[PDB]
A paper describes a structure:
To facilitate cryogenic electron microscopy (cryo-EM) analysis, human NaX was co-expressed with the canonical auxiliary β3-subunit, purified in mild detergent (glyco-diosgenin), and reconstituted into phospholipid nanodiscs. Prior to sample vitrification, the Na+ concentration was raised above the threshold reported to activate NaX (to 200 mM), and the resulting cryo-EM reconstruction of the β3-NaX complex extended to 3.2 Å resolution. The NaX channel resembles a four-leaf clover with VSLDs arranged in a domain-swapped organization. The β3-subunit is wedged between extracellular loops of the pore module and its single transmembrane helix is positioned against VSLD3. The intracellular DIII–DIV linker is bound alongside the pore (see below), and the carboxyl-terminal domain is not well-resolved, establishing that the overall architecture of NaX is highly similar to available human NaV channel structures determined in detergent. Despite the high Na+ concentration in our sample, no distinguishing extracellular Na+ binding site was observed, and residues lining the narrow S6-gate form a hydrophobic barrier to the passage of hydrated ions, defining a nonconductive state. Four lipids penetrate the lateral pore fenestrations in NaX to enter the central cavity. These features can unambiguously be assigned as three phospholipids and one cholesterol, where one phospholipid even straddles and seals the intracellular S6-gate. The NaX DIII–DIV linker is bound to a pore module receptor site reminiscent of the fast-inactivated state in NaV channels. The DIII–DIV linker therefore appears to restrict S6-dilation in NaX and may stabilize the nonconductive state.
Residue numbers in the entry:
A (entry chain B): 25 to 186
B (entry chain A): 107 to 166, 175 to 274, 283 to 404, 503 to 733, 921 to 1223, 1238 to 1304, 1308 to 1504
Amino acid sequence: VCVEVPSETEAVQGNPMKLRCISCMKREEVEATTVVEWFYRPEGGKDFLIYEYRNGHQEVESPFQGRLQWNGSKDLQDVSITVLNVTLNDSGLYTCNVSREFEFEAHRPFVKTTRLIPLRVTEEAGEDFTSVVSEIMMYILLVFLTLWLLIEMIYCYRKVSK
Amino acid sequence: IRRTTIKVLVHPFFQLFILISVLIDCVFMSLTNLPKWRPVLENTLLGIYTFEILVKLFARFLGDPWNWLDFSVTVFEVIIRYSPLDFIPTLQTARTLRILKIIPLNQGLKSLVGVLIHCLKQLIGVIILTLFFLSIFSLIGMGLFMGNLKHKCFRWPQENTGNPYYIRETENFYYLEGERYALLCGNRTDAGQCPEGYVCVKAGINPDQGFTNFDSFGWALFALFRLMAQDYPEVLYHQILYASGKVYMIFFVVVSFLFSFYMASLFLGILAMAYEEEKQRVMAPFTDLFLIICIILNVCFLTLEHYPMSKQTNTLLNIGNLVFIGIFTAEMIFKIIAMHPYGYFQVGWNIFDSMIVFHGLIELCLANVAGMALLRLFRMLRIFKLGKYWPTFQILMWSLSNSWVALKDLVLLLFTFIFFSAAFGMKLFGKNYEEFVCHIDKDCQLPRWHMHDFFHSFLNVFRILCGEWVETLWDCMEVAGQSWCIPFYLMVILIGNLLVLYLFLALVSSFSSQNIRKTCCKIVENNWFKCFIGLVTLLSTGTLAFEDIYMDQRKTIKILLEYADMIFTYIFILEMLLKWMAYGFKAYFSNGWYRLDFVVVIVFCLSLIGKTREELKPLISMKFLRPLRVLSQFERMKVVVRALIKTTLPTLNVFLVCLMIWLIFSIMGVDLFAGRFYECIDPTSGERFPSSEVMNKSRCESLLFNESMLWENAKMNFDNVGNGFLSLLQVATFNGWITIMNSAIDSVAVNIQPHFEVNIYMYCYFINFIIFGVFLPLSMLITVIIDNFNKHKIKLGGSNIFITVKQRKQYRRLKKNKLQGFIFDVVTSQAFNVIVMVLICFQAIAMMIDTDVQSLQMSIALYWINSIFVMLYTMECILKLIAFYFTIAWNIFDFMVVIFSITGLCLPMTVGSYLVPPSLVQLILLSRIIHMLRLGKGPKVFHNLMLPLMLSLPALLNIILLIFLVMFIYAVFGMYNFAYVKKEAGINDVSNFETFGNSMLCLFQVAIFAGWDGMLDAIFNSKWSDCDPDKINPGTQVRGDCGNPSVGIFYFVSYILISWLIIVNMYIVVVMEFLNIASK
Ligand SMILES: CCCCCCCCCCCCCCCCCC(=O)O[C@@H](COC(=O)CCCCCCCCCCCCCCC)COP(=O)(O)OCCN
Ligand SMILES: CCCCCCCCCCCCCCCCCC(=O)O[C@@H](COC(=O)CCCCCCCCCCCCCCC)COP(=O)(O)OCCN
Ligand SMILES: CCCCCCCCCCCCCCCCCC(=O)O[C@@H](COC(=O)CCCCCCCCCCCCCCC)COP(=O)(O)OCCN
Ligand SMILES: CC(C)CCC[C@@H](C)[C@H]1CC[C@H]2[C@@H]3CC=C4C[C@@H](O)CC[C@]4(C)[C@H]3CC[C@]12C
Ligand SMILES: CCCCCCCCCCCCCCCC(=O)O
Ligand SMILES: CCCCCCCCCCCCCCCC(=O)O
Ligand SMILES: CCCCCCCCCCCCCCCC(=O)O
Ligand SMILES: *[C@@H]1O[C@H](CO)[C@@H](O)[C@H](O)[C@H]1NC(C)=O
Ligand SMILES: *[C@@H]1O[C@H](CO)[C@@H](O)[C@H](O)[C@H]1NC(C)=O
């Protein structure tokens, strides 16, 4: 029921953007004490801080707060984050280092899975390339398919005349 | 000396006295456990039966085989009782054999069994062909699956009391919440998946105490015999598809097609021939409408009773009943005025109506207080009064009356055999069910199904006759050992099925007795135009399969489909507005097929507006009607739809009678069980409290000091007629019926905690339902379907009504050296041909020896055997090339087999690479055994038994294509509705609606009735809020988690009806061809 999908890596000045991030559990049945950390995104030392999760949400206690919102799922399967009014200064990498712990009352295994994305807030988004090339291909096909019929209702008509 | 004997032996009282004596013996042995008289009675009957022997043996004695039983039992008993021998348990077993005397002591049954055993000799061919095929497919099963079910999730890395027969090794392997056996898994991409921190390994025991495996021949034959019956199969599918990929699902489809259909059609057609071979050898009279209205309203008043029900409507229904007896007791004392009653009590119907008025003036005075509630159960008998006016019911009943004298004997024989098997089983196995109870059930108590007493053994036999045998046979083998349990079960299964089916055929036999216009009118009909739009129709159909949960992950494809939908609607619009130019406007709507096309053009138009506005988004569901365009496009579909209409619609007339009987049983249930299925449960574990802790509801809702308790209803109940019909349908398909029966037999009273097995006798209700509501109506339908199939087969002739006029020519074509290389004179010889066959046979028998646990000295001595066989095959192919073409198709098949065999035995030059799997070559060589069905080169009966499949392939192809189109429509609609349902019960990691593949496997196991209740019970998650309406699902635009019962019920019921109606015709197609060939 979970599905893993990359994020858009493209963002428009004057809008929010959602940084989706998904990390499925191989068995849906078990339960795990998740921890989630998002890293700094800057052209020097990226690792600094963004928005960590321990047992309840906490505050960045630095200057990367206020324009942020938790958009994650209730069971922490998905930990998506929305940034507000992205500005030209905002740029580069984002990294999400989720980790989990299981409890089978025998062996307590621990697993860790990084996930990282670039972003650049271009001055304005151009149109998507696929969603114009496909509209050209469609309109061309619908032109051909409507000259063909006309050619037939010339040839057959001329034949029927006699 | 021997004279006076006759004057006894032939006087009828010598028959009647012994019949009475046997009925006393068999009652007092079985329906009683009253002792202190069993040392007197047996010493009496050992006198009587010896008087019988010492009479009968003087007149004649061994001329009749029944006299071997009579003598051989009683001589052995006489050797026991009075000698030092004392095999007491064995003595009491043999006496159960006396029950069978009812056969020879009733000449009717003696002759019926005589002709049945005579006609048994017609079957020998089919039984051998069936065992041959079971052996081949079980060798294939050992090829594909041997060892797989030992897979488990093993804890890794490795780090450093109770009932002994239920300890789990949970420190080492991973178990689900409640299951007894470890989770199956596999290395493949689509197998099961381990939890984190576990690795897949082959270790330890198989499931089911070892009885479910493919690790040797024998048990594989057990598994295939289980699959042929398709008895409780779906857990085997689950285990195989967890141990190995979904790709292996092809195997079970092929197996169920060969065995559960064709072989059973051969048996049914042969017994249906044998039956006819046997049979050929033998003052206000007119004012009625008032009273029929004052019947139908009385019927309707009965249906409104339910639970709960307020007094201000109970008193309504009470006055209603009084009023209707205030009418019937008027009209009786009108009709008893017709001069006298001596005609009144002469006509058959009034000797029923006066019973109705006597019952209805019992239950109104001095039967209101201090009277038993079952007196009211007879009120339902009133619905039969409607039958007085209804010709169909009357002529069916009359047809049953005619046949009475024959059916009596078949019913009495079947009852005799059930009673014999029940008694013999109780004496043979009963003690073991208590000596070793601790294996069968935790807490060391007898389970619900056992053999410790006569009534439970009787129910167990009736259940074996319904099927269901494997789940009890596992306990039989677990308690009494296999060598005893297997012959008993196999005997009951075989002779039971034979009697049941011969009775079914007896019932069926009983019942059956401006030139632009010419331009467009050409452009529409050129064949290229047809094929183009046909292609567009199949493209526009297949594109719905891509809309699974991964739609948003396939980011690119979505945009292409988004434009393709508009291309397709454009083409169909230029089709419509051309046909209206051509045919003329009005003539377009006259023709029924173009109307369906028009409806599909509307579906395309609504679907494309809906997605433009959110408030109209629900319209986008309409597009799932698109596949219906296929049905009107292709000539092959229309002939099939017409054949189904021509054959099956006329059954509607008799269907109302079956609905009437089902309504009778539904009311008869609502009266007897409504509101009593409530129970008090632990809200976490779902098990009940015992009756000692929480006897009534008041303690189930205590005043908060200790309230770890929940009072709730049961998913299936008889609280009103609409739940009744659904519970009845669930009984009729033998799915989940055991949970209903457990609810019934546990139920006490409206607010009383149900207690284990209190009124066990309610099993009579379901026995009676299974006899009268299912078995008889089913044949009442099949006989009408056959009568119309014959009608139409005569109204035009034709090979079938299920095939197009072009295919009839195909049907009629299908039905039809000198240079001293003398090897030509050798390869032709019988002596060489028989040798080739002996080699093929030896190679198969030399394959049966293999097993999973196996020493290396044996494995290499099998490897070099298969290598010798590839050498022999290559040598004979080289010799054949001297006496010589690649023209013969079988000689192409053999040369392919040789090439593939060597390119596997030696692989790439015997040193080249790996991962060519061992035991591929064995299956390659095995494939040649198909030669033993060819006309000139094997047993002639195997060809004569395979001929119907050849002569019926086209109609089956057409029907299979229509089944596939219907399964496609239902798959797409379920894939849109029932994704995101929480995984539970019959919804799991393999059968679910996440994708088209899994939806097709669900609809398959539904069509075979392999547990549709387990899916419906998952759809009913909203029935007590076991769900989360707003749950975010990652990667997906859809929020929530909930099924919808109202849509679920409709979906499953309609699919079950349509599938059953198609499959019945698919059976008819084969059975009538077998019966046609067998005419010669
Ligand atoms: C518990 C046994 C399993 C373990 C071992 C299995 C070993 C393989 C057994 C070899 C069987 C070979 C023949 C199989 C025929 C099966 C019958 C059959 O399925 O065909 C039709 C039904 O069969 C018939 O109509 C004809 C059956 C007569 C066959 C035997 C004639 C009498 C033989 C009596 C000998 C007593 C045997 C004593 C044991 C040594 C279809 O009906 P259905 O089962 O699909 O539907 C079930 C409805 N309740
Ligand atoms: C005049 C021409 C004659 C030609 C004859 C040709 C026959 C054509 C064949 C038509 C194809 C029929 C399709 C299926 C036939 C098998 C039906 C059967 O024997 O039993 C069914 C009846 O259903 C049952 O209830 C089985 C258990 C019945 C219990 C037996 C106890 C009753 C005995 C008491 C006798 C009293 C009867 C009353 C007499 C007045 C079981 O259905 P199923 O599970 O096999 O369906 C397939 C699943 N997809
Ligand atoms: C009238 C009917 C005629 C009856 C006569 C039938 C006799 C024909 C016998 C020939 C059987 C052909 C089966 C060949 C498939 C090869 C299976 C295989 O071994 O594939 C390997 C490759 O894996 C695959 O599964 C690839 C996809 C093939 C699976 C297909 C299974 C369905 C087979 C249908 C059986 C029906 C044959 C009879 C048709 C009339 C598995 O290797 P592994 O390493 O994964 O397993 C061991 C590791 N522990
Ligand atoms: C066409 C391809 C792609 C799929 C296979 C089509 C046909 C052969 C499939 C689809 C549905 C299948 C049927 C589903 C139900 C039954 C009833 C069972 O008692 C015998 C097998 C039988 C009759 C199956 C035979 C094979 C079957 C008819
Ligand atoms: C130990 C249990 C054995 C039970 C079966 C005993 C053998 C019964 C045989 C009955 C044969 C009936 C046919 C007789 C000949 C005929 O009429 O054609
Ligand atoms: C026509 C009769 C066929 C009889 C075939 C019976 C096959 C089923 C019994 C299989 C037993 C296999 C060996 C049991 C002991 C073990 O598990 O090692
Ligand atoms: C893909 C959805 C399932 C479709 C199932 C039904 C397929 C029917 C195929 C009919 C083949 C007709 C061949 C002739 C066509 C032509 O004349 O061009
Ligand atoms: C998250 O993963 C690494 C783990 O080595 C962690 O040390 C660091 O904070 C993050 N780096 C990356 C590349 O994700
Ligand atoms: C059952 O209810 C009765 C009254 O209907 C009450 O007297 C009795 O105590 C109840 N049983 C309990 C509380 O176990």
